[PDB]
């Protein structure tokens, strides 16, 4: 196990490089999400090998495992699961900080950048590989002056 | 604290992006080292705040702190310190794996890529900020079929 500061600074270098390569926040958002997807498709293999979940396609069990096991294992934090839809097909992950944003305050010119957008791709890619089509999106971000960071996750369909 | 697999895959995404941006292994090596330098100049502040070292410019004490505290804290591993020069101005860090290379075997066409070159920049940038000019370079790499990964560090001058 390792503390996170070298990880967060390395992620910072990646965002910096993408900003150099695209000079447009929406393009950066997109590339972070695509990279995250590729990471998630690989990361799920590590996770399933190390965990006790096996084969399952239950959305609530999935929320619990993501929040209480995967976030802890890979980011050192445990977000809360809140704000369930009536159908039980949508939930939020609530993070007290932004785990990738220790000490990285945004320029006012970059209001549209979703700095930690990689994480949405990772969630979507990982779950695709266990036959669950989901959408993950930031709806709050402490970097933008919100009181929490919130990732909203929606179950679309079984694959 | 967090396990390393999301960190190593994120670093992988960074190397991948640089390979797309440059298509030349030497250019990638250079950019990783430059990014590492920028990271090290920031990381040293985190480290000094969290540690008991204060103000010091002793090369052997520095080797010990790097190996036994900083590597453990930021990468979850403790390299050995070996192979001291007679003058005590050069030493090696010996790593049993490549910490950033879990599951990333190189193409034969990329023999010149120093995949984890970011780490050399981090070492040099961090030490510059405590007034020590050093050179850090990979001299062995498990990714290239060597039996260990070895980073050679040389003290140049006080700044």
Curated annotation (Swiss-Prot), chains A, B:
Q: Where is the lipid attached (S-palmitoyl cysteine)?
A: 56
InterPro entries named among the record's database cross-references: Bet3 (IPR016721), NO_sig/Golgi_transp_ligand-bd (IPR024096), TRAPP_component (IPR007194)
Where does this polypeptide localize? Golgi apparatus, cis-Golgi network; Endoplasmic reticulum
Gene Ontology biological process terms from the UniProt entry: COPII vesicle coating; endoplasmic reticulum to Golgi vesicle-mediated transport; intra-Golgi vesicle-mediated transport; vesicle coating; vesicle tethering
PANTHER family associated with the record: TRAFFICKING PROTEIN PARTICLE COMPLEX SUBUNIT 3 (PTHR13048)
Function, as annotated, reads: May play a role in vesicular transport from endoplasmic reticulum to Golgi.
Q: How does it assemble?
A: Homodimer. Component of the multisubunit transport protein particle (TRAPP) complex, which includes at least TRAPPC2, TRAPPC2L, TRAPPC3, TRAPPC3L, TRAPPC4, TRAPPC5, TRAPPC8, TRAPPC9, TRAPPC10, TRAPPC11 and TRAPPC12. Heterodimer with TRAPPC6A. The heterodimer TRAPPC3-TRAPPC6A interacts with TRAPPC2L. Heterodimer with TRAPPC6b. The heterodimer TRAPPC6B-TRAPPC3 interacts with TRAPPC1 likely providing a core for TRAPP complex formation.
| Protein name (record) | Trafficking protein particle complex subunit 3
According to its UniProt entry, this protein's organism is Homo sapiens (Human)
Q: Which gene encodes it?
A: TRAPPC3
């Amino acid at each position: 196990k390792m503390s996170s500061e070298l990880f967060t600074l390395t992620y910072g270098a990646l965002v910096t490089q993408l900003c150099k390569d695209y000079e447009n926040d929406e393009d950066v958002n997109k590339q972070l999400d695509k990279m995250g997807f590729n990471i998630g498709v690989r990361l799920i293999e590590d996770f399933l090998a190390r965990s006790n979940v096996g084969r399952c396609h239950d959305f609530r069990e999935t929320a619990d495992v993501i929040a209480k096991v995967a976030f802890k294992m890979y980011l050192g934090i445990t977000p809360s699961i809140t704000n369930w839809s009536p159908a039980g097909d949508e939930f939020s992950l609530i993070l007290e900080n932004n785990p990738l944003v220790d000490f990285v305050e945004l320029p006012d010119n970059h209001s549209s950048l979703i700095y930690s957008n990689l994480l949405c791709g990772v969630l979507r890619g990982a779950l695709e590989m266990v036959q669950m089509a989901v959408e993950a999106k930031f709806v709050q971000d402490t970097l933008k002056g919100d009181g929490v960071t919130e990732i909203r996750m929606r179950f679309i369909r079984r694959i």
